[PDB]
Amino acid sequence: GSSGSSGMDMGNQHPSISRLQEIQREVKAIEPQVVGFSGLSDDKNYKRLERILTKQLFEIDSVDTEGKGDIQQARKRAAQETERLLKELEQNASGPSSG
């Protein structure tokens, strides 16, 4: 529903957190690039967009958790987020999702 209750104090930036943070800002920085997209399903620029997500996503799965909710959550939270946009594209493109 709303995950907002956790602390954070330690001298060390997990290699998984930074990643998600480096992959999240991407899908987010491109979130609008898709929502504000305008191209048929696979026109020329549709690839890039998708590629991004596809790339970012592939990175999400690459992000190890090691059984760390803090991470697991984000990751999984990014695994769905990324795909989400991806889906949008298909729609934002011009054609319907499925019908």
UniProtKB/Swiss-Prot annotation:
Residues 16-93 form the BAG domain. It comes from the Eukaryota. The fifth BAG domain is responsible for the interaction with HSP70 nucleotide-binding domain. Co-chaperone for HSP/HSP70 proteins. It functions as a nucleotide-exchange factor promoting the release of ADP from HSP70, thereby activating HSP70-mediated protein refolding. Has an essential role in maintaining proteostasis at junctional membrane complexes (JMC), where it may function as a scaffold between the HSPA8 chaperone and JMC proteins enabling correct, HSPA8-dependent JMC protein folding. Inhibits both auto-ubiquitination of PRKN and ubiquitination of target proteins by PRKN. Binds to the ATPase domain of HSP/HSP70 chaperones. Binds PRKN. Interacts with HSPA8. Interacts with JPH2. This is BAG family molecular chaperone regulator 5. It comes from Mus musculus. The chain holds residues 1 to 86 of 447 of the full protein.
